[PDB]
């Protein structure tokens, strides 16, 4: 019974515009300010999405706020790469309908290398032929893939919720294969695909953090929440107090 996939397909966030005025010359300040808006806006959907995930509400209230604040980067990035694959075919980074990056914008944003890694991540969806169901499960798993070293208020329930989503992932895979090797290798690819999101997210955390500090020097504006999160939560990740949960080592 696909009750679970039912829920994931139903609660999946629709399209979100960054409000970018594609009339303005692609400058550093304009591009990043629009991505910050996109992030702020897209953050709102992430919150509604999560609170709609099976079992998410049961987690403690504080932990609910923490897991979102720690894993939002990786979530938005993962989804972004999906939009780029299914759309612009991965040639470019489909951030929002009104904010699609090309080679030029990648350079002007002062984060060309990171964009390359994201484009590659985007390409992986093709190489691995990730079906839409696999995408959803993996994305859900990402919310539960980064936590504080000290632990959550109720780690007990977190470990169990995480464990379940993983089962769901396996369940998804083993619904077309028959071989003992087939389902096994597929799981290996995905768990790796998932791990690879972490290093990318970590570069953007660093990047946005530095950008925030010298935000007034470069005329880049950070919305209310985006500024608050990058200065309180992100620093815990960069300082190692919050760390991703990797499948492999």
């Amino acid at each position: 019974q696909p009750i679970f996939l039912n829920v994931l397909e139903a609660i999946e966030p629709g399209v979100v515009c960054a409000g970018h005025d594609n009339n303005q010359p692609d400058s550093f300040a304009a591009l990043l300010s629009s991505l910050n808006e996109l992030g702020e806006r897209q953050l709102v959907h992430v919150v509604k999405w999560a609170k709609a995930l099976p079992g998410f509400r049961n987690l403690h209230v504080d932990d609910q706020m923490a897991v979102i604040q720690y894993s939002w980067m990786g979530l938005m990035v993962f989804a972004m790469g999906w939009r780029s694959f299914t759309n612009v075919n991965s040639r470019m980074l489909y951030f929002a309908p009104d904010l699609v990056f090309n080679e030029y914008r990648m350079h002007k944003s002062r984060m060309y290398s990171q964009c390359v890694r994201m484009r590659h991540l985007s390409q992986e969806f093709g190489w691995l032929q990730i079906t839409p169901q696999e995408f959803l499960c993996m994305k859900a798993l990402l919310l539960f893939s980064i936590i504080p070293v000290d632990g959550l208020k109720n780690q007990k329930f977190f470990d169990e919720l995480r464990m379940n989503y993983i089962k769901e992932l396996d369940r998804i895979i083993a619904c077309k294969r028959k071989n003992p090797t087939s389902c096994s290798r597929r799981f290996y690819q995905l768990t790796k695909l998932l791990d690879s999101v972490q290093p990318i997210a970590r570069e953007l955390h660093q990047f946005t953090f530095d950008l925030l500090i010298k935000s007034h020097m470069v005329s880049v504006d950070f919305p209310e929440m985006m500024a608050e999160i990058i200065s309180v939560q992100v620093p815990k990740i960069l300082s190692g107090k919050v760390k991703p949960i990797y499948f492999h080592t």
Binding site: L43, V44, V47, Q64, M65, M225
Partner: peptide, 4 residues
């Protein structure tokens, strides 16, 4: 909170 504010957005939760």
């Amino acid at each position: 909170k504010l957005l939760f």
